Amino acid sequence: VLDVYIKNLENQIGNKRYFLKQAQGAIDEITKRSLSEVFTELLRKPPIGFSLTSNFLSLRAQSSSEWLSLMNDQSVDQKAMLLLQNNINSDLKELLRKLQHQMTIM
Amino acid sequence: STSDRSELEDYIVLENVYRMFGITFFPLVDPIDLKIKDASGEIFVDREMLGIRLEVFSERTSQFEKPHYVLLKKRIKSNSWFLFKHTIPSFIDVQGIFDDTNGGLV
Amino acid sequence: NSNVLLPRKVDSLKHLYSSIILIKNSRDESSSPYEWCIWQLKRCFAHQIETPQEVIPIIISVSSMDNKLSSRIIQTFCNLKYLKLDELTLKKVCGGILPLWKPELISGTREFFVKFMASIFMWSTRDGNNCTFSETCFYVLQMITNWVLDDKLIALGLTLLHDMQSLLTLDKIFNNATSNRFSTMAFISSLDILTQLSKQIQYLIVGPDIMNKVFSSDDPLLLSAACRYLVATKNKLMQYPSTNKFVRMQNQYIMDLTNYLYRNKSLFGVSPDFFKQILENLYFKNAKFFTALSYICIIILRRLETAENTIINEETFNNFFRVVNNIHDLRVKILMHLSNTANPYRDIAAFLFTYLKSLSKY
Amino acid sequence: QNDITQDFLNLISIRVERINGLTNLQKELVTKYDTLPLLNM
Amino acid sequence: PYTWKFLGISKQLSLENGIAKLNQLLNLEVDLDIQTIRVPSDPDGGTAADEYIRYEMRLDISNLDEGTYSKFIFLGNSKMEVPMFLCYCGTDNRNEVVLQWLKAEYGVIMWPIKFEQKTMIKLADASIVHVTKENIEQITWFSSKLYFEPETQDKNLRQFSIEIPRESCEGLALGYGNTMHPYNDAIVPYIYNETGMAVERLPLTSVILAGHTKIMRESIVTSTRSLRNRVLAVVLQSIQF
Amino acid sequence: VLITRIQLFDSNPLISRRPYYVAFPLNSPIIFHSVDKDIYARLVLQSISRTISERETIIFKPVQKIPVKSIHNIMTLLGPSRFAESMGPWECYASANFERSPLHDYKKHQGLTGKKVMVREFDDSFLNDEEPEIRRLRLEKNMIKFKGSASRYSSLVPIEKVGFTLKNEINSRIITIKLKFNGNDIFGGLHELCDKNLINIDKVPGWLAGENGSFSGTIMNGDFQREQ
Amino acid sequence: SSEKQWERIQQLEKEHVEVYRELLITLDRLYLIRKHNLSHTQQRLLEIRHQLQINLEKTALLIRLLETNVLFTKLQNLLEESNSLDYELLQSLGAQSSLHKQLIESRAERDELMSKLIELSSKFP
């Protein structure tokens, strides 16, 4: 049930790669031959879906899990840093008050 | 590739009817000494190798047995083969027979 | 003392050594822990140290304050030449040095920030799938978070936000075919910063191309943050006159977003003849898909089905004909249950109740 | 001015073969990396 | 048997001053000669970024024991990023008290130096270039014994060595041509040509010569006390950024 | 095979000795014995060499000096077997998994089907250093060079110790080097080191690749020969 | 014996959508060149058109498939397990934003206290 899907997917891969090669060769041939409203006319002009949905949503799930792990680790490091910073700020405030006292005494 | 396919099928069945003889000389190349001459980008073989395909045909089961292979490699400075890597089991003495044939030099 | 390598190496006062030297110096220039910080950062970049984890958090904690050391570090480190050495340690130091910076030296560093952001983007595209570039976008957005908190550096912040958002919206980073959620997380962070700006300079509109691209993506978190920004700029634009075609542009934005949403029927960035061309290429069923979000609706329908005893299309109407008692009202009930609770995807229901006045009474 | 234009410019700007039974000997000998017989018929 | 450990030095410093403080803290007397040496005294250097200032801080004590005998060979240059470093031997406590004094007085940053693979190759290249008094570089040879120690699954391949005798080394050097770098232009391309084992990427542990030196990844063990000029020049060149 | 356990004694009642094993394969001229060097080992081996003959005299020249571990390993290495000489990259010829009989089909033939190959590189393009099909083909190339056709790193036979010697000749100068190895399985770890792209497999010779396994001998102009 | 084939078809799906996106953008470039013998806005509306094409292909897949056999349980388990972490993601983002606000408050207090301490130390001088 999967081998025929692999077969038609590979046939579509080869067909699309041949179409890409012929398209690039034709545009390069016109550019080697070379020396507005047309874009608007393009705007009026024009095994895939399940594969793209599975790939897109699986990579979304993996990237969201990695983002959650990264943010949890950086959150606990930033929280420990904020705790140590606030403790140092409190001790420096107490030393500021005692230094003001020792300045008033002298 | 249909006429070439039929020609290759005739070539394969000709290889089969020659291989039914028992003693065939299949060509071979050791992949380490594929040196490039650097004159045009082509590849020449440094030391030639010639593989012997011994194949004994049974009669009771009426089928071919597992074929034993003998490989010969040309020496670098004598133009004579020396027995490189044979697969015959050791009760049939191979190196002494190769020394005995034609006085040692083949 | 003078042995700086044993002072800040890691005494009750041992946590407070660097501040003591900095107040005993009258600083103003290159002190001793400044040289120790820059030397340990160079030694950690050049891989001349066995363990950088015993040095880097100490560097971050001593460099979270002291704006002059932070400015010298960002001036002489954030380049491609130290980017190509080690991207992990650069990620750690830019996560530690950026969101506490708030520079006020020249206030002409727009070209420097866009040069650094373009260089890291060129390097992340030169690997081609690096899952690295959006992290420094998250950090530079958390520095945009503190730049707008003061009255100073707000115009620089908004133009850097516009440059960062226009640079973050290329299809090489995020696209609906094969991409990740990292740029989406950075974009919803930037949009949340835009909501926090609009809740309290005629550049709040993010530009219509980025608007149609953020509406066109099938990312539900991004869409909820987008309509959160839309109700924020609705609350900021209600006290403005309807001239100069920007309030009408916001009306066009919410009209197109409702065209994607529950309301049927049109120019959604492209002609409907192009819609008919696509529907003739691939294919009652002409409007059976006008509004991965519906799996959440089916799941929450099964969740509310627990309180009772026991693919929204015409097949759902056939299933309703097989045995509130409709198909047009179950979406309204789902929107109401998404409105009243504190579960996420709350802003889509907030937009659907703050607009389209015929359905605001639900 | 120049910054937004440079940003728009940066946004706008941004072998295996299969051998068979019949082939020439040079293309066979280039890809010969195994200790197997030659497949040129 | 003088194992030379290596440490780094952050800032460029002079050593003629402050040495009396070390004498007062130590109650000993040490001699600190100032040798303004220069690598490849042959005139193809330009006399720029080729000179160094060496401070051999000896300890002129009773030499009855070698493990307590400890030199301190220094180097410096006023043009590179990291200017200075040192290297110490012995197992004395005076090494600890003098690194204490160096950390305390001048206010510098010390860290041990770990070796690369190409750094070990250049050290094996430089530890055989002998300098004579007639302003030329004569090259001796040694039957070098390379070493490797990789880590594989289930400890498949524990450790394996490549040993090259002396006459073979001299033959490869004379067959390559006249150059001052044998171990990076002749032998390593020969090992890559005849074995395929690139020794720059394989995990080196101990480039050992024929009883002369023993270059490691964390230290250098020698037979004589002194260390040559090109060796410290290559080491100081290696730790740059 | 035939395993013979020879036990000896001494009188200070009878203090036993270490039991000495001599393993006879069924139809091979190679006889394994347990590793010992005392005078009892020479006595037992000499007595077997005298009593096995009965028509004309046989001597036992030892073919190896480095011991090997198991009896399956020494049987696959040096007994009567198809793997007795190939043992390396020639392991395909010792199992014949590449050809069929002439009475087989021609439709399922390697001449007709064709094998997927990779274009080798011959310029020095290794010292200057994604696509998972090419990665799978590179791992298949390493599997071909260090083994037969297609755990997962250990070879057929684990070899303990190997010491090579490469005596080349450039401009009439005999330039010797002396490789030595160690560990549990040498060529499996070498295949693992090549699998991490540390050894350029285009320039790995045959004697290093694993052929003539458990044989520590020199090389004089491109052809292996064992040591006595 | 399905995991190797499933990761093979995962790699094939990634290569397929890569060559599909390449096909779409090169057909757009082919029509742009051959339609006449080019800006940021024009290319942006082109990528908008591409995103709409992939979105209609996605919903056409969904209405063709959904609107317990083989090649269907993967999509069902994927949509079951892909959307269960958004609340935790917003929780972590709110925690990071509150941590950043607390760090701003502490850094402002520390800088004011540092300026006052250097004032008192200049008074000590």
Question: What phi, psi does E131 have (nearest 5°)?
Answer: -100, 125
Q: Does E192 touch chain F (CB under 8 A)?
A: yes
Q: Which two tokens stand for residue B46?
A: 């440094």
State which H helix or E strand residue F49 sits in. Answer: helix F39-51
Cβ pairs bridging C and E (under 8 Å): 32
Q: Does F28 touch chain B (CB under 8 A)?
A: yes
Q: Which two tokens stand for residue D1?
A: 């001015």
CA G106 to chain centre: 33
Q: Which one, of C102, C24, C92, C105, lies nearest residue C61 by Cα? A: C92
Buried b or exposed e, range F101-131, using 16+ CB within 10 angstroms? bbeeebeebbbbeeeebbebeeeeebeeeee
State which H helix or E strand residue F9 sits in. Answer: strand F9-10
State which H helix or E strand residue G29 sits in. Answer: helix G3-34
Residue labelled with tokens 């015993």: C54
Task: Concatenate the DSSP letters of all residues of E22-91 into one string.
Answer: HHHHHS----EEEE--BS--SSTTTTSS-B--EEEE-----TT-SSS---EEEE--SSSSS-EEEEE-S-
Cβ pairs bridging B and D (under 8 Å): 34
State which H helix or E strand residue G78 sits in. Answer: helix G73-81
Buried b or exposed e, range A2-19, using 16+ CB within 10 angstroms? eeeeeeebeebbeebeeb
Q: How far is CA C246 from CA A7, C227, C242, in A?
A: 52, 17, 8
Q: Which residues of C touch D14 (CB under 8 A)?
A: 121-122, 125, 170, 172
Q: Does F192 touch chain E (CB under 8 A)?
A: yes
Query: Which residues is chain A interrupted after (C–N above 2.5 Å)?
Result: 35, 46
| CB proximity list for F156: less than 8 A, separation 6 or greater | F76, F83, F87, F91, F147
Buried b or exposed e, range C193-225, using 16+ CB within 10 angstroms? bbbebbeeeeebbbeebbbbbbbbbbbbbbbbb
Q: How far is CA C37 from CA A28, C8, C66, in A?
A: 55, 10, 12
Interface-testing mutation among G38, G40, G42, with chain D (most D C-beta atoms within 10 A):
G40
Q: State the CB neighbour count (10 A cutoff) for residue C279.
A: 15
Cα–Cα distance measured from residue C104 to residue E193, given in angstroms and rounded to the nearest whole number = 60
Q: Which two tokens stand for residue B33?
A: 């000494």
> E131 pairs with which residues across the strands?
E137
What is the DSSP-derived secondary structure letter of residue C29? S
| CB proximity list for C302: less than 8 A, separation 6 or greater | none
Interface-testing mutation among G2, G3, G27, G33, with chain A (most A C-beta atoms within 10 A):
G33
Q: Which residues of D touch C126 (CB under 8 A)?
A: none
What is the DSSP-derived secondary structure letter of residue F224? B
Query: Which residue in chain G has the smallest CA separation from A23?
Result: G30
Q: Which two tokens stand for residue A104?
A: 């008033």
Helix or strand or coil: residue E4? strand
For residues G15 and A47, is the Cβ–Cβ distance under 8 A?
no
Cα–Cα distance measured from residue C337 to residue C33, given in angstroms and rounded to the nearest whole number = 57
CB contact under 8 A, D14 and C121: yes
Cα–Cα distance measured from residue C328 to residue G30, given in angstroms and rounded to the nearest whole number = 44
Is chain G touching chain B, with at least 3 CB–CB pairs below 8 Å? no
What was the elucidation method? cryo-EM
Parallel, antiparallel, or unpaired for β F218-220 and E129-131? unpaired
Helices (H), chain A: 3-33, 37-43, 49-104
Q: Which residues of F touch E197 (CB under 8 A)?
A: 198-199
Q: Which two tokens stand for residue F222?
A: 């491109």
What is the DSSP-derived secondary structure letter of residue B25? E
Q: Which residues of C touch E6 (CB under 8 A)?
A: none
CB contact under 8 A, C49 and E239: no
Long-range contacts of F69-75 (CB under 8 A, 24+ apart): F69/F158, F69/F160, F71/F1, F71/F3, F71/F23, F71/F32, F73/F157, F73/F158, F74/F23, F74/F32, F75/F1, F75/F25
Cα–Cα distance measured from residue D14 to residue G108, given in angstroms and rounded to the nearest whole number = 40
**Which among C32, C40, C42 has the least Cβ separation from residue E241?**
C42
For residues D14 and C118, is the Cβ–Cβ distance under 8 A?
no
Q: Does B12 touch chain D (CB under 8 A)?
A: yes
Q: Which two tokens stand for residue C176?
A: 């609906």
Q: Which one, of F74, F35, F96, F64, lies nearest residue F157 by Cα? A: F74
| CB proximity list for A85: less than 8 A, separation 6 or greater | C61, C64, G103, G106, G107, G110
Helices (H), chain C: 17-25, 32-45, 56-63, 67-75, 80-83, 87-97, 110-126, 133-147, 155-167, 182-198, 208-216, 220-237, 247-260, 272-282, 294-304, 314-321, 330-340, 347-354
Question: What phi, psi does F127 have (nearest 5°)?
Answer: -85, 15
- Classify burial at B61, counting beta carbons within 10 Å of its beta carbon; exposed 0-12, middle 13-18, buried 19 or more: exposed
Cα–Cα distance measured from residue F86 to residue F111, given in angstroms and rounded to the nearest whole number = 24
Interface-testing mutation among A50, A54, A70, with chain C (most C C-beta atoms within 10 A):
A70
State which H helix or E strand residue E213 sits in. Answer: strand E213-215
Q: How many angstroms away from the CA of D10 is the closest CA of chain C?
A: 8
Q: How many angstroms away from the CA of B12 is the closest CA of chain D?
A: 8
CB contact under 8 A, D35 and B45: no
| CB proximity list for C35: less than 8 A, separation 6 or greater | C4, E10, E11
SS (H, E, C) B34-103: CCECCCCCCECCCCCEEEEEECCECCCCCCECCCEEEEEEECCCCCCEEECCCCCCCCCCCHHHHHHHHH
**Which among F179, F185, F204 has the least Cβ separation from residue E196?**
F204
Question: What phi, psi does B18 have (nearest 5°)?
Answer: -70, -35
Q: How many angstroms away from the CA of A59 is the closest CA of chain G?
A: 10
For residues F203 and F81, is the Cβ–Cβ distance under 8 A?
no
For B104, what's the count of Cα atoms within 13 Å in the CB-facing half-sphere? Answer: 1
Interface-testing mutation among D12, D13, D14, with chain G (most G C-beta atoms within 10 A):
D12
For F11, what's the count of Cα atoms within 13 Å in the CB-facing half-sphere? Answer: 0
CB contact under 8 A, D29 and B29: yes
Q: How many angstroms away from the CA of B4 is the closest CA of chain D?
A: 9
